[PDB]
Design a binder for this molecule. Structure first.
Ligand code: WNV
Length: 460
C-alpha cells in the first residue's frame, strides 16, 4: 500500500450566529453553491482531511462532532477519525481524517490565543491544530477577529497577536512563528474585514451582488487592500473570490442582506462583506492548488453563509535510509556562497545565522557576519563564503530536493531573531552554484532579505 505524494484537504469556515445548524449541511462538505465549486463527478470521493472552523458556535463539542461525522458518513460512506478538536469560547476547530491515515498522523498540537485587553478580551481570538502527515507538517488556524467596519487596524493587530502567540508545531523551531513552522499553513475564519464603501451606497451594493458584479466591491474589500499595502497576511495566498458576500443575511432565507443599524448591532451598519475567508501559506516550490473556494446557498440558520475551500497539497513520505535518521550521510552537503542579509534595523549589533531543518540532526549556528552600510541607508550583513557546510541526515536526492532550510538572523548581543525566512532545496541542478533568496520577517512583518548562492550535493 504506497504512501501518498498528494492529499486533498477540505477547509470550512462558518460563523453559526449562535444558532443550531439545519438538519442537512452536506452542501458545505461537497463545495456546492456559489463561487469556485467542486465538480459533481467528485461527490463520492472523500477528501483526506476535513478541517472545520466555526465561530459563534452554540453546540457542545460532542453535539458538533456527531453532526459532522454523520454528515461525512452520509456523503462518503466513510467513518472519519477525530484527529483533534479545540474550542475557545464559541470559536472551534475540528480535524477529521480518513481512517487509512490514522498511522500517518502524529505530533498533534492544539492551542488558542485570546485577543485584546480588558474591554476587548472576552470573545475574539483563534484556535489552531498542527500535526505531521508522514514527512509533511500541516498547520490550521481558525480565527474570529474584531468586528466592525472601522476596526481594520484592530483586526491587523489581532492577526499579529495570533501569529506571535499561537504555540503550534515543533517547539525546537524556537526563532520561528507559525508562519514558518509548516510545509502548509491554512488560516481561515470570520476575519471580519468589510467592504469599505459609504453607508449611503448599501442598496447600490446589493444591486451589484444581485448582478453577480463583484469587481467594484472587491476593490474596496479591506482584507485585499490591507494585504496589498503589506499591513496583514504578508506572504499568504487567497483564491479569487467569485461568490457573493457571506455577511450579513436575514436568517432563514438568502434573499435579503440585513445591513441597517439596529440596537442589536450597537447602532452599526453591516454593509454586505466577505467576512468569512480561507488563506494559506506553503513553503516555496511545494505543490498546493486551490480546487474550490465558495459559499453555500442552502444553509440559512446564521446571518453568515458557510465558506468552503479545498486544496491539493503535496506530501512526502517518512524517509529511512541505511544512514539517517540517527546519523549523517556524508554523500550529502549544503554549501552557501556570496551570502548576505539586508536588514531594515536602525541598530548596530553583530549578527549570526541559525539554519533549522528536519534534514539536519540539529540546528546550525554560523559565525558572525561583517556589517557594512548599504547605498540607501540599509544594514548589510555579509557572510561571504564563511557560512558552515550543512550535513543532511539523508543524501538521496528523492528526499533532499524535497526539503527546506529555515534561516533566522540573530543579534549576538540579545540572541533575538531580527528576521526569519525559508529556502527550498528543490533546485534546478545539483553540484551547481545557484541563486537563493528569501524575504525575512519578524512577527510576520518584513524586516529584510537574505540572498546568495547554494551548492547542493546529493548521492546522485
Ligand atoms: C490581493 C493581494 C494582496 C497582496 C499580495 C497579493 C499577491 O500575492 N501578489 C502576487 C500581488 C495579492 C494578490
Amino acid at each position: 500500500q504506497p504512501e501518498p505524494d498528494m492529499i486533498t484537504i477540505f477547509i470550512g469556515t462558518w460563523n453559526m450566529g449562535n444558532a443550531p445548524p439545519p438538519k442537512k449541511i452536506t452542501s458545505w462538505f461537497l463545495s456546492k453553491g456559489q463561487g469556485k465549486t467542486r465538480d459533481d463527478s467528485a461527490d463520492y470521493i472523500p477528501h483526506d482531511i476535513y478541517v472545520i472552523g466555526t465561530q459563534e458556535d452554540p453546540l457542545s463539542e460532542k453535539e458538533w462532532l456527531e453532526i459532522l461525522k454523520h454528515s461525512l458518513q452520509e456523503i462518503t460512506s466513510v467513518t472519519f477519525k477525530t484527529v483533534a478538536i479545540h474550542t475557545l469560547w464559541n470559536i472551534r476547530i475540528v480535524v477529521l481524517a480518513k481512517p487509512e491515515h490514522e498511522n500517518r498522523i502524529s505530533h498533534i498540537c492544539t492551542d488558542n490565543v485570546k485577543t485584546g485587553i480588558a474591554n476587548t478580551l472576552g470573545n475574539k481570538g483563534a484556535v489552531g491544530v498542527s500535526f505531521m502527515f508522514n514527512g509533511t507538517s500541516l498547520g490550521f488556524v481558525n480565527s474570529h477577529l474584531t468586528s466592525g467596519s472601522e476596526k481594520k487596524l484592530r483586526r491587523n493587530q489581532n492577526y499579529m497577536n495570533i501569529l506571535r502567540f499561537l504555540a503550534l508545531g515543533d517547539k525546537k523551531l524556537s526563532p520561528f512563528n507559525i508562519t514558518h513552522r509548516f510545509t502548509h499553513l491554512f488560516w481561515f475564519g470570520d476575519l471580519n474585514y468589510r467592504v469599505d464603501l459609504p453607508t449611503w451606497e448599501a442598496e447600490t451594493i446589493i444591486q451589484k451582488i444581485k448582478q453577480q458584479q463583484y469587481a467594484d466591491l472587491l476593490s474596496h474589500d479591506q482584507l485585499l487592500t490591507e494585504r496589498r499595502e503589506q499591513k496583514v497576511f504578508l506572504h499568504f495566498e487567497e483564491e479569487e473570490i467569485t461568490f457573493a458576500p457571506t455577511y450579513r443575511f436575514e436568517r432563514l432565507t438568502r434573499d435579503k442582506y440585513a445591513y441597517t443599524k439596529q440596537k442589536a448591532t450597537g447602532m452599526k451598519y453591516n454593509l454586505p462583506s466577505w467576512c468569512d475567508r480561507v488563506l494559506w501559506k506553503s513553503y516555496p516550490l511545494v505543490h498546493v492548488v486551490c480546487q474550490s473556494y465558495g459559499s453555500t446557498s442552502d444553509i440559512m440558520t446564521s446571518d453568515h453563509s458557510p465558506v468552503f475551500a479545498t486544496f491539493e497539497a503535496g506530501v512526502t513520505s517518512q524517509f529511512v535510509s541505511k544512514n539517517g535518521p540517527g546519523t549523517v550521510d556524508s554523500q550529502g552537503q549544503i554549501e552557501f556562497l556570496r551570502c548576505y542579509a539586508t536588514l531594515k534595523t536602525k541598530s548596530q549589533t553583530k549578527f549570526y545565522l541559525e539554519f533549522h531543518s528536519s534534514c539536519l540532526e540539529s540546528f546550525v549556528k554560523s559565525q558572525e557576519g561583517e556589517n557594512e552600510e548599504g547605498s540607501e541607508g540599509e544594514l548589510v550583513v555579509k557572510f561571504g563564503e564563511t557560512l558552515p557546510k550543512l550535513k543532511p541526515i539523508i543524501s538521496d536526492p528523492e528526499y533532499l530536493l524535497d526539503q527546506h532550510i529555515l534561516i533566522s538572523i540573530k543579534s549576538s548581543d540579545s540572541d533575538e531573531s531580527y528576521g526569519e525566512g525559508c529556502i527550498a532545496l528543490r533546485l534546478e541542478a545539483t553540484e551547481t552554484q545557484l541563486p537563493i533568496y528569501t524575504p525575512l520577517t519578524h512577527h510576520g512583518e518584513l524586516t529584510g532579505h537574505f540572498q546568495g548562492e547554494i551548492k547542493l550535493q546529493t548521492s546522485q
